[PDB]
Amino acid sequence: PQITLWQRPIVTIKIGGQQREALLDTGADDTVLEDINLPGRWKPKIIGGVGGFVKVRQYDQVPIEICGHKVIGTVLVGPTPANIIGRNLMTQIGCTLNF
Amino acid sequence: PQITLWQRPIVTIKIGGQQREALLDTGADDTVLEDINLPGRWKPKIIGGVGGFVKVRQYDQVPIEICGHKVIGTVLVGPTPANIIGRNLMTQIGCTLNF
Numbered sequence: 001p002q003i004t005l006w007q008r009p010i011v012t013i014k015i016g017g018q019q020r021e022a023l024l025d026t027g028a029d030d031t032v033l034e035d036i037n038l039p040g041r042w043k044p045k046i047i048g049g050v051g052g053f054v055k056v057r058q059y060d061q062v063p064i065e066i067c068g069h070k071v072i073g074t075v076l077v078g079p080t081p082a083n084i085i086g087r088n089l090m091t092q093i094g095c096t097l098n099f
Numbered sequence: 100p101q102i103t104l105w106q107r108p109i110v111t112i113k114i115g116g117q118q119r120e121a122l123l124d125t126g127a128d129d130t131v132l133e134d135i136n137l138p139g140r141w142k143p144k145i146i147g148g149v150g151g152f153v154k155v156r157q158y159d160q161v162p163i164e165i166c167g168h169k170v171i172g173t174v175l176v177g178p179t180p181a182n183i184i185g186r187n188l189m190t191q192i193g194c195t196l197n198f
Protein backbone atom coordinates (compact mmCIF):
# COMPACT_ATOMS: atom_id res chain seq x y z
CA PRO A 1 0.00 0.00 0.00
CA GLN A 2 0.90 3.66 -0.37
CA ILE A 3 0.59 6.36 2.27
CA THR A 4 0.39 9.99 1.21
CA LEU A 5 1.65 12.55 3.73
CA TRP A 6 -1.10 15.16 3.90
CA GLN A 7 -1.81 13.71 7.38
CA ARG A 8 0.45 12.08 9.98
CA PRO A 9 1.24 8.50 8.92
CA ILE A 10 -0.29 6.74 11.93
CA VAL A 11 -0.56 2.97 11.98
CA THR A 12 -1.80 0.41 14.47
CA ILE A 13 0.76 -1.81 16.13
CA LYS A 14 0.53 -4.82 18.41
CA ILE A 15 3.09 -5.22 21.16
CA GLY A 16 2.84 -7.11 24.43
CA GLY A 17 -0.48 -8.48 23.26
CA GLN A 18 -1.90 -4.96 23.14
CA GLN A 19 -2.80 -2.52 20.41
CA ARG A 20 -1.40 0.99 20.16
CA GLU A 21 -1.05 3.75 17.57
CA ALA A 22 2.30 4.99 16.33
CA LEU A 23 3.81 7.30 13.74
CA LEU A 24 5.85 5.87 10.83
CA ASP A 25 8.85 8.14 11.31
CA THR A 26 11.66 8.18 8.77
CA GLY A 27 13.46 10.85 10.78
CA ALA A 28 13.75 8.47 13.74
CA ASP A 29 16.66 6.02 14.00
CA ASP A 30 14.89 4.10 16.73
CA THR A 31 11.39 3.24 17.89
CA VAL A 32 10.10 5.02 21.02
CA LEU A 33 6.78 4.25 22.72
CA GLU A 34 5.36 5.99 25.79
CA ASP A 35 2.05 4.25 26.58
CA ILE A 36 3.19 0.68 27.21
CA ASN A 37 4.84 -1.48 29.86
CA LEU A 38 7.29 -4.09 28.57
CA PRO A 39 8.42 -7.19 30.55
CA GLY A 40 11.97 -8.22 31.42
CA ARG A 41 15.41 -6.65 31.61
CA TRP A 42 16.36 -3.42 29.88
CA LYS A 43 19.35 -1.12 29.31
CA PRO A 44 19.24 2.56 30.21
CA LYS A 45 19.67 4.76 27.13
CA ILE A 46 19.66 8.44 26.18
CA ILE A 47 18.26 9.74 22.90
CA GLY A 48 18.25 13.30 21.61
CA GLY A 49 15.92 15.30 19.43
CA VAL A 50 14.37 18.71 18.96
CA GLY A 51 14.18 20.13 22.46
CA GLY A 52 16.98 18.09 23.99
CA PHE A 53 17.69 14.60 25.29
CA VAL A 54 15.67 12.24 27.46
CA LYS A 55 16.29 9.04 29.39
CA VAL A 56 14.45 5.94 28.20
CA ARG A 57 14.52 2.16 28.74
CA GLN A 58 15.96 0.05 25.93
CA TYR A 59 14.20 -3.29 25.47
CA ASP A 60 15.80 -5.67 22.98
CA GLN A 61 14.38 -8.44 20.82
CA VAL A 62 10.80 -7.26 21.27
CA PRO A 63 8.21 -8.95 19.04
CA ILE A 64 5.98 -6.39 17.37
CA GLU A 65 3.42 -6.49 14.57
CA ILE A 66 3.08 -3.43 12.35
CA CYS A 67 0.83 -3.24 9.32
CA GLY A 68 0.81 -6.90 8.31
CA HIS A 69 4.31 -7.78 9.48
CA LYS A 70 5.59 -9.62 12.53
CA VAL A 71 9.12 -8.47 13.27
CA ILE A 72 11.57 -8.37 16.19
CA GLY A 73 13.53 -5.31 17.18
CA THR A 74 14.63 -2.90 19.84
CA VAL A 75 11.91 -0.75 21.39
CA LEU A 76 12.65 2.21 23.62
CA VAL A 77 10.12 3.01 26.34
CA GLY A 78 10.04 6.45 27.88
CA PRO A 79 8.71 10.01 27.67
CA THR A 80 7.77 11.09 24.16
CA PRO A 81 4.83 13.23 23.07
CA ALA A 82 4.12 10.71 20.32
CA ASN A 83 4.68 6.99 19.77
CA ILE A 84 7.29 6.65 17.03
CA ILE A 85 8.18 3.73 14.73
CA GLY A 86 11.76 4.33 13.61
CA ARG A 87 13.87 3.05 10.75
CA ASN A 88 15.06 0.08 12.81
CA LEU A 89 11.57 -1.38 12.30
CA MET A 90 10.42 0.33 9.10
CA THR A 91 13.26 -1.38 7.21
CA GLN A 92 12.13 -4.79 8.45
CA ILE A 93 8.56 -4.25 7.27
CA GLY A 94 9.75 -3.12 3.83
CA CYS A 95 8.63 0.51 4.15
CA THR A 96 10.27 2.89 1.67
CA LEU A 97 10.08 6.54 0.62
CA ASN A 98 9.16 7.17 -3.01
CA PHE A 99 8.78 10.23 -5.21
CA PRO B 100 13.03 7.21 -7.35
CA GLN B 101 12.91 5.01 -4.26
CA ILE B 102 14.71 5.46 -0.96
CA THR B 103 15.23 2.45 1.31
CA LEU B 104 15.60 3.17 5.02
CA TRP B 105 18.69 1.24 6.07
CA GLN B 106 20.36 4.67 6.31
CA ARG B 107 19.02 8.12 7.19
CA PRO B 108 17.15 9.54 4.17
CA ILE B 109 19.35 12.60 3.67
CA VAL B 110 18.81 14.81 0.63
CA THR B 111 20.39 17.99 -0.68
CA ILE B 112 18.32 21.15 -0.60
CA LYS B 113 18.79 24.66 -1.92
CA ILE B 114 17.42 27.58 0.05
CA GLY B 115 18.51 31.20 0.09
CA GLY B 116 20.84 30.44 -2.80
CA GLN B 117 22.70 27.97 -0.63
CA GLN B 118 23.07 24.22 -0.48
CA ARG B 119 22.39 22.22 2.67
CA GLU B 120 21.55 18.65 3.64
CA ALA B 121 18.37 17.65 5.45
CA LEU B 122 16.48 14.55 6.58
CA LEU B 123 13.23 13.53 4.85
CA ASP B 124 11.19 13.20 8.02
CA THR B 125 7.69 11.73 7.90
CA GLY B 126 7.41 12.13 11.67
CA ALA B 127 7.78 15.91 11.37
CA ASP B 128 4.79 18.16 10.68
CA ASP B 129 7.06 21.06 9.85
CA THR B 130 10.48 21.74 8.35
CA VAL B 131 13.20 22.87 10.75
CA LEU B 132 16.68 23.99 9.66
CA GLU B 133 19.52 25.09 11.96
CA ASP B 134 22.44 26.04 9.69
CA ILE B 135 20.94 28.86 7.63
CA ASN B 136 20.04 32.54 7.85
CA LEU B 137 16.79 33.58 6.13
CA PRO B 138 15.90 37.15 5.02
CA GLY B 139 12.86 39.18 5.98
CA ARG B 140 10.22 39.11 8.68
CA TRP B 141 9.32 36.09 10.77
CA LYS B 142 6.95 35.00 13.55
CA PRO B 143 8.15 33.45 16.80
CA LYS B 144 6.99 29.85 17.18
CA ILE B 145 7.40 27.00 19.66
CA ILE B 146 7.59 23.37 18.58
CA GLY B 147 7.81 20.25 20.70
CA GLY B 148 9.45 16.89 20.27
CA VAL B 149 11.37 14.20 22.11
CA GLY B 150 13.14 15.99 24.92
CA GLY B 151 10.84 19.01 25.13
CA PHE B 152 10.00 22.21 23.29
CA VAL B 153 12.19 24.86 21.70
CA LYS B 154 11.68 28.37 20.33
CA VAL B 155 12.26 28.87 16.61
CA ARG B 156 11.64 31.53 13.94
CA GLN B 157 8.82 30.89 11.48
CA TYR B 158 9.55 32.10 7.95
CA ASP B 159 6.63 31.82 5.53
CA GLN B 160 6.50 31.49 1.75
CA VAL B 161 10.13 30.42 1.49
CA PRO B 162 11.24 29.13 -1.93
CA ILE B 163 13.09 25.84 -1.53
CA GLU B 164 14.38 23.22 -3.98
CA ILE B 165 14.40 19.54 -2.98
CA CYS B 166 14.68 16.34 -5.01
CA GLY B 167 14.46 18.37 -8.22
CA HIS B 168 11.26 20.09 -7.07
CA LYS B 169 10.93 23.84 -6.63
CA VAL B 170 8.31 24.53 -3.98
CA ILE B 171 7.26 27.24 -1.53
CA GLY B 172 6.51 26.59 2.10
CA THR B 173 7.03 27.51 5.72
CA VAL B 174 10.51 26.94 7.09
CA LEU B 175 11.38 27.10 10.78
CA VAL B 176 14.86 28.27 11.73
CA GLY B 177 16.20 27.41 15.15
CA PRO B 178 18.11 24.93 17.30
CA THR B 179 17.83 21.35 16.09
CA PRO B 180 20.43 18.58 16.11
CA ALA B 181 19.46 17.76 12.53
CA ASN B 182 17.97 19.63 9.59
CA ILE B 183 14.50 18.22 9.00
CA ILE B 184 12.21 18.30 5.96
CA GLY B 185 8.68 17.84 7.27
CA ARG B 186 5.43 16.74 5.70
CA ASN B 187 4.55 20.35 4.83
CA LEU B 188 7.18 20.08 2.10
CA MET B 189 7.32 16.33 1.42
CA THR B 190 3.69 16.43 0.30
CA GLN B 191 4.47 19.14 -2.24
CA ILE B 192 7.33 17.18 -3.77
CA GLY B 193 5.15 14.08 -4.05
CA CYS B 194 7.02 11.96 -1.51
CA THR B 195 5.07 8.95 -0.21
CA LEU B 196 5.59 5.96 2.09
CA ASN B 197 5.15 2.55 0.47
CA PHE B 198 5.22 -1.03 1.75
Ligand SMILES: Cc1nc(COc2ccc(C[C@H](NC(=O)O[C@H]3CO[C@H]4OCC[C@H]43)[C@H](O)CN(CC(C)C)S(=O)(=O)c3ccc4c(c3)OCO4)cc2)cs1
Binds near residue numbers: 031127
Ligand atom coordinates in the same frame (compact mmCIF):
# COMPACT_ATOMS: atom_id res chain seq x y z
C1 LIG C 1 1.23 17.79 22.35
C2 LIG C 1 2.60 17.67 21.73
N1 LIG C 1 2.85 17.04 20.62
C3 LIG C 1 4.15 17.07 20.26
C4 LIG C 1 4.68 16.42 19.00
O1 LIG C 1 5.38 15.24 19.28
C5 LIG C 1 6.31 14.66 18.50
C6 LIG C 1 5.92 14.17 17.22
C7 LIG C 1 6.91 13.56 16.38
C8 LIG C 1 8.26 13.45 16.82
C9 LIG C 1 9.30 12.85 15.95
C10 LIG C 1 10.44 13.76 15.40
N2 LIG C 1 9.83 14.98 14.86
C11 LIG C 1 10.04 16.27 15.14
O2 LIG C 1 10.86 16.60 15.98
O3 LIG C 1 9.32 17.21 14.49
C12 LIG C 1 9.12 18.57 14.93
C13 LIG C 1 9.06 19.51 13.72
O4 LIG C 1 7.67 19.50 13.31
C14 LIG C 1 6.84 19.30 14.46
O5 LIG C 1 5.84 18.30 14.20
C15 LIG C 1 6.07 17.16 15.04
C16 LIG C 1 6.93 17.65 16.24
C17 LIG C 1 7.73 18.83 15.60
C18 LIG C 1 11.40 13.12 14.35
O6 LIG C 1 10.61 12.54 13.34
C19 LIG C 1 12.38 12.07 14.90
N3 LIG C 1 13.31 12.68 15.82
C20 LIG C 1 14.66 12.93 15.33
C21 LIG C 1 14.87 14.21 14.48
C22 LIG C 1 14.64 15.51 15.28
C23 LIG C 1 16.24 14.20 13.78
S1 LIG C 1 13.18 12.24 17.48
O7 LIG C 1 13.85 13.20 18.33
O8 LIG C 1 11.81 12.14 17.92
C24 LIG C 1 13.96 10.70 17.67
C25 LIG C 1 13.21 9.49 17.56
C26 LIG C 1 13.87 8.24 17.69
C27 LIG C 1 15.29 8.20 17.92
C28 LIG C 1 16.03 9.41 18.02
C29 LIG C 1 15.37 10.65 17.90
O9 LIG C 1 17.33 9.12 18.24
C30 LIG C 1 17.44 7.70 18.27
O10 LIG C 1 16.13 7.16 18.07
C31 LIG C 1 8.63 13.95 18.12
C32 LIG C 1 7.65 14.54 18.95
C33 LIG C 1 4.98 17.74 21.12
S2 LIG C 1 4.04 18.35 22.42
